[PDB]
């Protein structure tokens, strides 16, 4: 079909590699494809260089190398393995006394490898390392909140890389330095650095009254050694002030590059703010036996010049994106690598003392367990390491571009006020102002802008076109916020004739401030509107017409869209739906030009120009992390000529290379019998008939048979006391057969466990005697289908003990996995949503005959209530519906770019072209205007919609240009008394489905200590009746219902047992007893040496333990 | 100290704190019996005091004692008693309960004010013992054990048990609740109408008191068991009996949205 795209803005550059923030970060961190001699001192190389040489025998580092993965990605996902590469390090042990050298390559374990799409495979599960925003290290100057005319100087290194130092001018006049919560006069530390009164007087004397507050005679009287011992006594009281100890401590605190590490960005920010040059990333140096200052004097000078009001000195905006930087995958992984390496170095140093001081190899000296433990900890249990969101490809694409202010080394939720969550003016082009979580995490979790990229220092940069004179060049400069604040940047929609600015007045920004400016003052220009918003936000057509609060929900809900079996791209696109499928490697493309040799459901074989025959296998019906089916379908035919970059196979939720998160349905905006009341949605049974919004979902079940002290657990078809009807679909070994239908209660894998030793009750003795049948040795522990689940068994995986290639955790004989899939049709309670924030649950599925329908008999698909539009102020869906009506009758789709798309006149023109097809067809078919159409036109000209006096066709066209049509009620056949908006809308089926969320419980599992029911549907748990529900029951005065909640329905053991027996016997429920959690409270208070006594009216003790706890 | 599903062992931190205490106490006794100098005895006594402090209220004084290879402070008795997760607020002033369920809500315009749509399977589970008794009264099962064994498998469920469940719930009411429960009308009593499907059907007029809408909200259902609880729910808690706000005295169940629009 035809695809019409609007907009006159020409983007000089395409979108960057959307997952490059992960890929390039990790590639720079590993440096695997760089030959070891040509590596830079970065990442793993920097960590090794920092940890070594280990001095004490001297152990030094030469070079590392990374091997090839022992298993591929698919095998890792299959076998619960980490996709990783072996790490080796060539170390030479040197004896500086002997000169002896023993060199060896030691194995340091494995390091997880990032896949092509920017994710990891940890213990079989896909995971993403979310980038972390934080304060950039450096030297900042903030206003002192207590004293207005004063300021605080803050020296901040990298996280975990040293203390924060605070320089302050105390009210008494002396300058204080704050380190590790202790304060002292900065003059003492300056004296340790070797400064004398002459130097300070000549250096800082230009700022009048502060240098005298800096002067202290007793400190200048004593030489730097006495000052060093004095400072050590101030910082470490009680520690005997041995001079070498003081040297070591002060060096490790300030001058040690191993214990103190300003950022490379920190060094750059310090050099740029103070106007100096750093020889390293420490605040001072230990050179020629003494201490030499680096940072302290420039910072103190800047502080004094700022306090004195010396011009050219400013305070720092700490939320400015020039002072806030991103730590990506490589940096966090390298930090944990460095920690593990330091622990390994401690082990090495301890080994260089014990044992034989002569016979030692690098292999004997190195224990790699700390390093492996640190890396495994980071990748498995860190907060920034998250379960990959692969609901649809866009889910993972967005997940990889996430930015978190939380996590280790960052904010807690209470530490986050309004300042951090705010949208800063420097977020322009860097951080999306729309896409952020609704609720407690708002402002803390954000998304990277579309055109943004993180530089090597960690600052987000955005592109701008250079403007010389009045001409806009095609050269683009990626700027940081700090450099962006220098220029006057015009908007991307400023009129142009050629490369020349065609407007006499342009809209521009100066330090984020909007301004009207002459074309001679234009230094740069925006690349595109797309650069201001994230990837998800850039997929919302007519975004300029949607309120931001609802566009947020649209962006966040595109993530939750479920891949449909008949998924299709929207009729109104933004132009990004192809590129998203491209960069999220779900779809398959051709490497070079060539011809398709073979097309199968499982594979595609292509013969390229090179003559080489390349076979691409297709992922078919694979289960994602969230249960959605990831499967690739071939889009080419045998003998087809393809070019470089042509589509070969469609991934999940993609149609011919375009992103397909939902379906295009014929929607009518009107109330309907209160079934769309309060955002609810009414749908047509025709949607289920033609399998719209039907999705495939796979669930994974697992069971282990292990060795017990009572005998082995066995996976077997022989299960005690079971009928052949129960064992029908199990094979010889006890595993359910592939293709069988399983429902709740059915057996997936049969298993027997040896009965725990137990004396049969006398009742069992008499029963056994009556029936004369021996009680079996084993008990039925088979895995069964939980309530509400089931489907078709598509796969079984079995792993035993003693078969080639597999080894389980200790004690486990065998493990069996069963994969069950299900085709889910749309039903009542499932959640739908569009890209504009309109979301609702399906409340009614009507038969086709009850659906409102067009005059030509076409029924609508979805009925949306118009009451959801005015308060929400998201008009983008309305324009989408109008343009979708136009494209529905013209048989074409559209690309309406963001902030530069189809405007109302063009939509009116397309609607006229569509009305011609919609009505002249009828008129040629030999039919005139309907009677009910005439009545609707009467009521419409009463509404001022159509001009009175025109022909019925002219008035119907006037209505059609407004996007409204005559609609017939399928129940009566009479029309709706007014013209109604009808058109094609793109609606998605979200991951929230009633089938997953419906749950109920009579009785079930209880907790160990509290004896209260467990929680969760997965544990068959009960609903929590919290404090506020108790408040509700109290305010109602419902005492017995509340007491049932507190006793019979939970943790009153006698009470609940007697209640169940009474109800199954038809008797009324008994009087409740003492809640077991109260006895738990009594005993836990006794463990705190407190006597809690229940007393009667006579103040006599009452035993709620019934003699069981008293001797 | 319990053995979990896979045969692994899980234990409370109080055991480790008690072990610290007992080790230090026995070491102190042995050091006293062997006549150690006063420096050693003093160190041991101070360690014993620190261990008792750790057992009673860890982190109260000094650094919190942690398990090896972990920064997690061990959970002492004081931590068990106090806090949002403490014994009082988690297990005494509120509990998880039996005979309760939860599902996504859907607008039920055809409902009367005192009614709510309840899914069939939810009702079968919530009223399960009443249903067993009714299936024993009628000839559906020989006894309660056979009725339960029959309800266990979903394919063994015939259509007479649904009529029996209709007979069971006759006249009775259930409690619907939506979090957050800001005022007493966050819980309301409704007569259940059994419905096919998995969604709870809520009356429109009560959506304002629950602050409920249908963009994906879920509600919890509870079954008052006794005749006393059922009477309390039908008389005091019934939706149709609470039409005015206890705060302002104004009508709370009143026309809104589409109703106002049409009128």
């Amino acid at each position: 079909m035809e695809i019409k795209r609007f907009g006159r803005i020409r983007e000089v550059i395409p979108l960057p590699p959307l997952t490059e923030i992960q890929v390039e970060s990790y590639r720079r961190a590993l440096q695997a494809d760089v030959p070891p001699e040509k590596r830079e001192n970065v990442g793993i190389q920097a960590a090794f260089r920092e940890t070594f040489p280990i001095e004490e025998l001297v152990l030094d580092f030469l070079e590392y190398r990374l091997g090839e993965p022992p298993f591929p990605q698919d095998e890792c996902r299959e076998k619960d393995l980490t996709y990783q590469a072996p790490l080796y390090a060539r170390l030479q042990l040197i004896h500086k006394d002997t000169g002896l050298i023993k060199e060896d390559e030691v194995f340091l374990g494995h390091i997880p490898l990032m896949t092509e799409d920017g994710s990891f495979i940890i213990n079989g599960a896909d995971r993403v390392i979310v980038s972390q925003i934080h304060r950039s290290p450096g030297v900042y100057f903030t206003p002192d909140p207590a004293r207005p005319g004063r300021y605080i100087a803050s020296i901040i290194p990298l996280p975990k890389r040293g203390p924060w130092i605070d320089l302050e001018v105390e009210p008494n006049g002396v300058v204080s330095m704050k380190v590790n919560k202790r304060k002292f006069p900065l003059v003492l530390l300056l004296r340790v650095l070797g400064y004398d009164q002459e130097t300070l007087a000549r250096e800082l004397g230009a700022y009048g009254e502060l240098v005298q507050g800096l002067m202290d005679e007793s400190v200048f009287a004593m030489r730097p050694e006495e000052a060093l011992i004095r400072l050590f006594t101030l910082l470490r009281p009680g520690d005997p002030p041995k001079r070498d100890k003081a040297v070591a401590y002060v060096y490790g605190l300030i001058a040690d590059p191993r214990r103190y590490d300003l950022g490379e960005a920190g060094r750059y920010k310090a050099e740029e703010k103070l106007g100096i040059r750093l020889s390293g990333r420490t605040l001072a140096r230990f050179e020629d036996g003494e201490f030499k200052d680096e940072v302290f004097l420039p910072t103190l000078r800047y502080l004094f010049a700022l306090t004195a009001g010396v011009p050219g000195h400013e305070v720092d905006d700490i939320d400015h994106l020039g002072n806030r930087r991103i730590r990506t995958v490589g940096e966090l992984m390298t930090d944990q690598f460095r920690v593990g390496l330091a622990r390994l170095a401690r082990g090495v140093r301890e080994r260089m003392l014990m044992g034989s001081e002569d016979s030692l190899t690098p292999a004997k000296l190195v224990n790699s367990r700390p390093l492996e433990a640190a890396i495994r900890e980071f990748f498995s249990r860190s907060q920034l390491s998250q379960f990959k969101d692969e609901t649809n490809p866009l889910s993972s694409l967005r997940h990889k571009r996430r930015i978190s202010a939380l996590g280790p080394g960052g904010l807690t939720r209470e530490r986050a006020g309004f300042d951090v969550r705010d949208v800063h003016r420097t977020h322009y082009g860097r951080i999306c102002p729309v896409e952020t979580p609704e609720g407690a995490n708002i402002g803390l979790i954000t998304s990277l802008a579309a055109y943004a990229r993180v530089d090597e220092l960690g600052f987000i940069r955005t592109p701008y076109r250079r403007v010389v004179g009045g001409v806009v060049t095609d050269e683009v400069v990626y700027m940081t916020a700090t450099e962006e604040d220098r220029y006057t940047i015009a908007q991307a929609n400023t009129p142009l004739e050629g490369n020349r600015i065609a407007a006499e007045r342009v809209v521009a920004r100066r330090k984020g401030e909007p301004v009207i400016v002459s074309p001679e003052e234009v230094e740069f220009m925006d690349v595109s509107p797309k650069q201001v918003f994230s990837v998800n936000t850039n997929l919302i057509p007519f975004l300029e017409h949607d309120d931001a609060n609802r566009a947020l929900m649209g962006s966040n809900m595109q993530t939750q869209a479920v891949p449909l079996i008949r998924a299709q791209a929207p009729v109104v696109m933004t132009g990004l739906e192809e590129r998203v499928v491209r960069d999220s490697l779900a779809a398959l493309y051709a490497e070079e030009d060539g011809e398709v040799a073979k097309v199968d459901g499982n594979r595609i074989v292509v013969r390229y120009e090179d003559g080489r025959l390349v076979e691409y296998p297709l992922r078919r019906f694979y289960r994602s992390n969230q249960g959605t089916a990831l499967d690739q379908r071939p889009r080419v035919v045998v003998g087809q000529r393809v070019r470089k970059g042509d589509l070969l196979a469609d991934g999940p939720a993609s149609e011919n290379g375009f992103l397909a998160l939902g379906q295009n349905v014929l929607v009518a905006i009107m109330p309907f019998d209160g079934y769309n009341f309060e955002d609810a949605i009414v749908i047509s049974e025709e949607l289920l008939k033609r399998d719209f919004y039907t999705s495939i979902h796979i669930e994974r079940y697992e069971i282990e048979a292990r060795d017990t002290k009572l005998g082995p657990e066995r996976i077997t078809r022989d299960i005690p006391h079971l009928s052949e009807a129960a064992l029908r679909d199990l094979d010889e070994e006890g595993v359910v057969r592939i293709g069988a239908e399983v429902k709740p209660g059915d057996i997936l894998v049969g298993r027997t466990s040896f009965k725990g030793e137990s004396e049969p009750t006398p009742e069992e003795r008499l029963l056994r005697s009556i029936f004369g049948e021996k009680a079996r040795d084993v008990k039925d522990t088979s895995l069964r289908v939980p309530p509400g689940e089931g489907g078709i068994v598509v796969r079984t995986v079995r792993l035993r003990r003693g078969d080639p290639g597999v080894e389980l955790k200790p004690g486990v004989r065998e493990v069996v996995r069963v994969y069950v899939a299900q085709k889910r049709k749309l039903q009542v309670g499932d959640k739908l949503a569009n890209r504009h924030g309109n979301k609702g649950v399906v409340a009614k599925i009507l038969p086709v005959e009850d659906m409102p329908h067009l005059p030509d008999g076409t029924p609508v698909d979805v009925i949306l209530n118009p009451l959801g539009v005015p308060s929400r102020m998201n008009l983008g869906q309305i324009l989408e519906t109008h343009l979708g009506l136009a494209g529905y009758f013209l048989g074409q789709r559209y690309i309406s770019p963001i902030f530069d798309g189809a405007k109302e006149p063009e939509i009116k023109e397309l609607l006229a072209q569509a009305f011609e097809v919609y009505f002249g067809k009828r008129k040629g078919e030999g039919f005139g205007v309907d009677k009910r159409e005439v009545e609707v036109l009467r009521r419409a000209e009463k509404l001022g919609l159509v001009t009175p006096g025109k022909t019925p066709e002219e008035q119907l066209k006037e209505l059609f240009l407004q996007g409204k049509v005559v609609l017939y009620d399928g129940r009566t056949g009479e029309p709706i008394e007014g013209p109604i908006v009808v058109g094609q809308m793109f609606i998605m089926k979200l991951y929230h489905m009633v089938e997953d969320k419906m749950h109920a419980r009579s009785t079930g599992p209880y907790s160990l200590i509290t004896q209260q029911p467990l929680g969760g549907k997965a544990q068959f748990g009960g609903q929590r009746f919290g404090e506020m529900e108790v408040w509700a029951l109290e305010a109602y005065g419902a005492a017995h219902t509340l007491q049932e909640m507190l006793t019979l329905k939970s943790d009153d053991i006698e009470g609940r047992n007697a209640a169940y027996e009474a109800i199954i016997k038809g008797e009324d429920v008994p009087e409740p007893s003492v809640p077991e959690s109260f006895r738990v409270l009594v005993k836990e208070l006794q463990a705190l040496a407190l006597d809690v006594q229940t007393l009667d009216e006579k103040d006599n003790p009452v035993d709620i333990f019934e003699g069981l706890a008293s001797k | 100290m319990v053995q979990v599903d896979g045969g692994r062992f899980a234990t409370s931190d109080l055991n480790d704190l008690y072990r610290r205490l007992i080790n230090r106490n026995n070491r102190l006794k042995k050091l006293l019996a062997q006549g150690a100098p006063e420096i050693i005895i003093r160190n041991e006594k101070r360690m014993l005091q620190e261990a008792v402090d750790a057992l009673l209220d860890n982190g109260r004084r000094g650094a919190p004692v942690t398990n090896p290879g972990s920064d997690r402070p061990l959970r002492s008795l004081t931590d068990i008693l106090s806090g949002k997760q403490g014994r009082f607020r988690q297990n005494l002033l509120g509990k998880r309960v039996d005979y309760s369920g939860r599902s996504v809500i859907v607008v039920g315009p055809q409902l009367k004010l005192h009614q709510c749509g309840l899914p069939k399977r939810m009702a079968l589970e919530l009223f399960k013992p009443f249903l067993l008794k009714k299936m024993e009264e009628k000839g559906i099962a020989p006894n309660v054990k056979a009725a339960r064994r029959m309800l266990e498998r979903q394919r063994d469920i015939k259509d007479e048990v649904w009529d029996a469940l209709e007979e069971v719930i006759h006249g009775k009411v259930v409690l619907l609740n939506r979090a957050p429960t800001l005022h007493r009308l966050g819980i309301q009593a409704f007569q259940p109408v059994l419905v096919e499907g998995q969604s709870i059907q809520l009356h429109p007029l009560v959506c304002e008191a629950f602050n409920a809408d249908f963009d994906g909200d879920q509600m919890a259902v509870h079954v008052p068991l006794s005749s006393f609880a059922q009477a309390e729910a039908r008389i005091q808690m019934l939706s149709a009996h609470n039409l005015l706000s206890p705060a302002s005295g104004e009508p709370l169940a009143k026309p809104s949205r589409d109703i106002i629009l049409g009128l």
Binding site: G238, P240 | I39, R42, N43, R46, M47, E50, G62
Partner: peptide, 14 residues
């Protein structure tokens, strides 16, 4: 407040 430092100080007195 630090038991290790206190014990080391007590040890340093002999």
């Amino acid at each position: 407040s630090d038991p290790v430092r206190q014990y080391l100080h007590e040890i340093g007195q002999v």
